[PDB]
């Protein structure tokens, strides 16, 4: 009922801000395709640009989540900054193709493991790919990926929140909504919901190493990080 509506709003929010792999015209590039290097500049340029576009979509997504824009502006910002890498990493891993060991970005750009490494992932590469491989067999749909993204974002344990209890309260209906949706879709598998939740814990771990990678990449890249990336991650 009221749970049904919350699910539908979150499904729509995600679907409308996230093109699926099947919808995209995959294309490749020859850029350092086979040799691991510390950084490929042309790949970094494409990757950072796509990242900027994805952050914009993530904000659009957040604004469609019930109650999000009712939080203080300071808390909306704090939540978005804290969840930024978690959501980006979830999104790119959602477009993993095992056969060629590739991930596909929102414009269709399809990079292999070596190119992902070369683009900026560096020491993060194998962990991110491990995550993608463990995500895939869960067979999540838009509602489930959308809900997990929302649960990751609307988290009351983030440092520097003005109203953490209020954030906790807003998260409660999302956890309930996912629990009831997952058991509807997969009645035979009651172990699915907690296995879904531990992806968040995995994501948190990866994004912590991600913040370390932001540091080391800044030393490697030619100029400065793009302004929006700076706002989110600095």
């Amino acid at each position: 009922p009221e749970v049904g509506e919350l699910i539908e709003k979150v499904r729509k929010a995600h679907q409308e801000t996230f093109p699926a792999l099947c919808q995209l015209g995959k294309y490749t590039t020859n850029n350092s395709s086979e040799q691991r290097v510390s950084l490929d500049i042309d790949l970094w340029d494409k990757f950072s640009e796509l990242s900027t576009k994805c952050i914009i979509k993530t904000v659009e997504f957040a604004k469609q989540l019930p109650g999000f824009t009712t939080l203080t502006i300071a808390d909306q910002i704090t939540l978005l900054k804290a969840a930024c890498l978690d959501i980006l990493i979830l999104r790119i891993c959602t477009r993993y193709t095992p056969e060629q060991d590739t991930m596909t970005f929102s414009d269709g750009l399809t990079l292999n493991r070596t190119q992902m490494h070369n683009a900026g992932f560096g020491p993060l590469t194998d962990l991110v790919f491990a995550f993608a491989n463990q995500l895939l067999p869960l067979e999540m749909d838009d509602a489930e990926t959308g809900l997990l993204s929302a649960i990751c974002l609307i988290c009351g344990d983030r440092q520097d929140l003005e109203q953490p209890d209020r954030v906790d309260m807003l998260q409660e209906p999302l956890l309930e909504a996912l629990k009831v949706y997952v058991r509807k879709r997969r009645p035979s598998r009651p172990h699915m919901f907690p296995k879904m939740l531990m992806k968040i814990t995995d994501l948190r771990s990866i994004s912590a190493k991600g913040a370390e990678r932001v540091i080391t990449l800044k030393m490697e890249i030619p100029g400065s990080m793009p302004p929006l990336i700076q706002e989110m991650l600095e």
Binding site: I56, V59, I73, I77, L80, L228, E231
Partner: peptide, 10 residues
């Protein structure tokens, strides 16, 4: 957070 503020309004 100039850009983020702008995006949050729109």
């Amino acid at each position: 957070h100039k850009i983020l503020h702008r995006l949050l309004q729109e």
